[PDB]
Symmetry: C2
Subunit: 677 residues, 2 copies
């Protein structure tokens, strides 16, 4: 023994209390919890606008070389990546690309004006376009083209306009929902989602996008679904008509994918400055345009392309305020999923470097971005589908990177539409698939969790299967609920243990864990590694009698039958402990004379009324048997709420408390020794 | 100090491990977990049939006087109580009373043959008839009476038969569901419901029944509902047509209620043997029959009565096996609610005396009872609505009480129908209301929980409002989920505390709690009374920096700015702890030189990957600041899963563990003293 000598007396509970006194419990009384605002405090409003507008630190505090170069490179890279991504998302939405461009341009600006994140390429997300198509098919008629008077071979431009309008309304509704959420300071909801939730959910997103791209890789017009086996029905529909349909589409897709792999190899083997300091993909766009125009293989197979790209911009407009009635549940589900994914992405980036991000600010940012896009004839967007990860590699220090990006995209679209008016619906698909595989290759955590624990497997897999098959919103909600159920199970099946004693110490560990530990006569220890709420209550009593081996009802019956077999030849004026009625006869079973029971509570977080009742029953029962029970851990809450419940008649129950396990041990030893008379 | 002298050396973790060795970890390997059955073990099958058929202890082990008298008195009392209850439930079901009698008779018998409970009067439950009417109105047409050819003034006997058939099918489906549940050994679901759940849920049941009786107290034929404000819409419908409708009904109801109160007073003031050792109500039946027949006030107001009571019994029949398709969701909801209420009642009785009840046995009992009643042209039943409580007061020792009861009811119905063929639909209502007030008068736990805790209020009230307004099934499910949410909140907002030291002891308690406790220099203690799962994680770090006052980022910024202001005038070859870069300058803030941080984990039940990551971050961050961190409670699970996660490079991180808080205290003291060189 180098140190740690105590020589302190025995403290059960009352020794403490009589040795102690409460201090004051001073608190902030009524009306003193608001005496900060309601005046012209420049500090208060200054800090409020600081947390609302993070901009107030950017231009005043900016670099000259590193910031500029990082912003430029990151913005150009993100824009070149996301432009085909925007096109693909718009075509998935079955809207002309111009709306995708609007989403890529305006909300980026409203975010650069609003949002505390730094390294994130805010843009449209895929499943968003997925539910866009889901509405466009469910709430929007597909094969009912109302004759306006022209009856074109495809007069669906009116149906497309209806799609635009319904997306407009739903995006506005989602934006206002997000704004209302933000003004209520929701960060609690941000943390309820786990890390495996985010990871598996992104996996399901990737597989859904993969399915959609495979469908739109060849041009088979089938039904779109959003229900049970929705992706399954989509893929079987694609399969049932794939044969001898298009070969130019597959050929161009495979060749562009090979070009993309060659670029992967070129930028991955070496990291230089002259050709490209950043792995890009625009040369694929260049070659696709060249093949379509100069080589002119469109008519060589009569293959199709993106089509026409309306050149110009649009004035603002508001959605019609008489149609939101029926489109309510869809809108709210979309807002829920949009926030879930966005704030998830937000935290999963903010956790990275020496910077933190308050979600509520990002929530109001996204709410305003969606509402404004709706006003600006645009659909709502999300944090990222994979580009934000690209943004990470491109070191987008400040938010000016995304601003300059979106400005570059707007300049390109307005000053040019012809150079890319003729691109197929497969090159963008291959780009999307490249991004998907890039973002999924590391989605092989299954061994990590497998070596880690079962529960991570459970939560991962249930999220994956619920989000993939069922609706992304339904998958999300079920996944969150089942994560909470994982928590309750973890605290439902604890690890009951029976402690021993480390010789000549006050340490107590489970006997099954080691051989060096010993036991103490007449004494049993039962440690619980979980609280006792209503649910995790009675099975605790069962496990107690089980591991301890002392079934007190068995004791009573054995005493009764043994005496039968021998027979053939002043306010609570109550004792909280009986004695042994056995008159010391030779019909005793070979049961050890364990006399006292000790339950560790140092690992008990809280307690509750059902638990109070069951502990009272257990204690009274053992006392009736004539077996002592002692409780270790009389700290604050356990005693507080046990006293709150009608548990004590100021009895020796108080004496049954012990602050230390070993303190209880020695108290019991002393009690037994005194009992020796 | 009387005892408790230790003088034991310093044990962080490795001192333990090098001082210890694991024992064996022997387990039951593959194929040895089933070597009990698959042979002709008379013990195994004997005990199996014991737990399946509790009867094997009743006739062989029976008394001669006490059992007989208790069974007789309990059975007669329960039967006389439940017979009008059965009539009321049938009329609520809008079926002729004969079906209520079938429910009162057959399933009681199948239970007396199956079920380990002793003191319970198994019978029909009200809300069951409520959802019966709900189906009879929703899935069964109400005002569409198909002309069969006779076109009577009320040809609805065919519609009533349709009601009977649909109840028949749904009861069969619920019975088979319960049986399937039972064979899967469900006791987990039994405990997930709390005590306040049961109490508040019964309150809502009582108010619903009260509403129904008030409606059928005067004969206003309105619409029945099962949705939002269902009871509210029912009661407003009743109110909108109540005026000058019936006065004989209210008069007879009030007079019979006064008779019931007089009986209450007579049996409550004294407890004798000659007039009635048990408070009964049959004299109300006698007087109602006398008024209807001899006094003959029916035509005096042209008031109505129960009607005709078909005399006789019925042969068995099975439901049509081509209609269960559409009636699936309703059937499953009914089975869910039936088990919930029944097993709740079962536990709430089994907990009472020296007897325990395994629910799965009761689940298979109820499943077979429902299925058989369906086969025997009968609707399914439940444990009780209030009579079981009567059964308690009547000391129904064994299950023969209910058997003799149901036999008495069958004898009365078959040998007599005329003596009660003419009874109004108000006397039974008053009886039901008497039972309801009897069962609710003690449903004033609100002060009990209010003095107890907030959480009980939350759970009680949410159950009450969800079950009353929304559907009883929906109310149930929402109530259970919100109870689990109460658990997660309780472990989401812990009680962070900062421990001090009891002078010259190793005890450590919160400083805010008492004045006698002191502090230890350069040392801070942060105790958590809740685990660290994914959710309850980052706010923990926040509260740490908050209560401790040591914002390490603040420390870094302060050091940086202070030095700026001074300036104007081999495998993991890594240190897990930095030092102080401050060169001891007079620009230091007046911050205390607290050098080490100690986090109690003795109250930490478990850990998880998100928590692992956040602890790693916190530790690394403080080490970088140059502040030590030590962990108390290196018992089993925390170290186990921290090691499982990529946490240790076999570094001094192991040395950062401590089995005892005070052990960590002294270790830090020693480290600092050694640092003094």
């Amino acid at each position: 023994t180098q140190r740690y000598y105590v020589e302190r007396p025995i403290f059960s509970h009352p020794v403490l209390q009589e040795r102690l006194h409460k201090k004051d419990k001073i608190s902030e009384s009524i009306g003193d919890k608001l005496k900060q605002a309601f005046t012209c405090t420049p500090k208060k409003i200054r800090n409020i606008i600081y947390m609302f507008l993070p901009i107030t630190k950017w231009l005043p505090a900016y670099r000259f070389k590193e910031y500029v170069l990082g912003d430029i490179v990151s913005g150009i890279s993100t824009g070149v990546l996301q432009l085909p991504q925007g096109l693909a998302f718009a075509m998935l939405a079955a809207v002309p690309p111009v709306f995708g461009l609007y989403s890529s341009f305006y909300p980026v600006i409203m975010y650069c004006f609003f949002g505390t994140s730094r390294h994130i390429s805010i843009g449209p997300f895929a499943v968003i376009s997925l539910m866009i198509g889901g509405v466009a098919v469910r709430l929007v008629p597909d094969d009912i083209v109302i004759p306006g008077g022209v009856n074109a071979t495809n007069s669906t431009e009116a149906r497309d306009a209806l799609r635009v309008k319904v997306a407009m309304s739903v995006t506005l509704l989602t934006g206002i929902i997000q704004f209302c959420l933000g003004v209520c300071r929701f960060g609690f909801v941000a943390i309820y989602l786990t890390e495996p939730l985010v990871r598996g959910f992104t996996t399901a997103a990737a597989v859904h996008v993969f399915t959609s791209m495979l469908k739109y890789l060849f041009g088979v017009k089938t039904k779109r679904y959003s229900g049970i086996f929705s992706v399954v029905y989509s893929t079987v529909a694609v399969l049932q008509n794939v044969k001898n349909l298009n070969v130019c589409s597959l050929g161009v897709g495979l060749m562009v994918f090979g070009l993309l792999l060659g670029g992967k190899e070129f930028n991955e083997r070496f990291k230089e400055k002259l050709p490209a300091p950043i792995p890009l993909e625009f040369f694929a766009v260049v070659m696709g345009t060249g093949i379509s125009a100069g080589f002119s293989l469109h008519e060589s197979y009569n293959v199709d392309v993106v089509g026409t790209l309306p050149l110009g911009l649009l004035p603002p407009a508001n959605p019609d305020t008489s149609l939101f009635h029926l489109v309510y549940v869809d809108a709210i589900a979309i807002a829920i999923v949009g926030f879930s994914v966005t704030i998830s992405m937000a935290k999963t980036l903010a956790n990275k470097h020496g910077y933190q991000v308050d979600g509520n600010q990002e929530l109001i940012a996204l709410g305003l971005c969606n509402s404004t896009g709706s006003l600006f004839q645009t659909f709502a967007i999300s944090c990222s589908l994979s580009r934000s990860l690209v943004q990470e590699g491109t070191g987008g220090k400040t938010q000016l990177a995304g601003c300059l990006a979106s400005l570059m995209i707007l300049l390109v679209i307005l000053a040019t539409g012809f150079l890319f008016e003729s691109l197929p619906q497969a090159v963008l698909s291959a780009i999307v698939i490249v991004n998907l595989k890039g973002m999924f290759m590391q989605f092989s955590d299954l061994p990590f969790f497998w070596r880690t624990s079962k529960i991570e497997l459970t939560i991962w897999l249930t999220t994956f299967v619920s989000s993939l098959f069922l609706g992304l919103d339904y998958g999300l909600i079920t996944a969150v609920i089942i994560a909470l159920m994982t928590v309750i199970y973890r605290t439902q099946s604890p690890s009951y243990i029976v402690l021993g004693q480390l010789p000549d110490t006050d340490v107590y560990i489970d006997i099954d864990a080691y051989e060096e530990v010993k036991e103490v006569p007449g004494i049993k220890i039962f440690q619980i590694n979980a609280p006792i709420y209503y649910a995790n209550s009675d099975l605790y009593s069962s496990a107690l009698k089980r591991k301890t081996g002392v079934n007190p009802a068995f004791i009573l019956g054995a005493r009764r039958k043994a005496m039968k077999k021998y027979a053939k030849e002043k306010y609570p004026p109550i004792v909280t402990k009986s004695t042994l009625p056995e008159e010391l006869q030779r019909f005793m079973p070979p049961g050890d004379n364990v006399h006292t029971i000790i339950l560790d509570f140092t690992q008990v977080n809280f307690m509750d009324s059902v638990g109070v009742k069951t502990l009272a029953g257990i204690v009274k029962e053992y006392g009736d048997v004539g077996i002592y029970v002692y409780l270790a851990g009389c700290s604050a809450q356990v005693v507080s709420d046990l006293t709150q419940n009608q548990f004590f008649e100021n009895p020796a129950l108080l004496d049954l408390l012990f602050h230390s396990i070993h303190d209880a041990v020695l108290g019991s030893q002393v009690r037994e020794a005194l009992a020796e008379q």
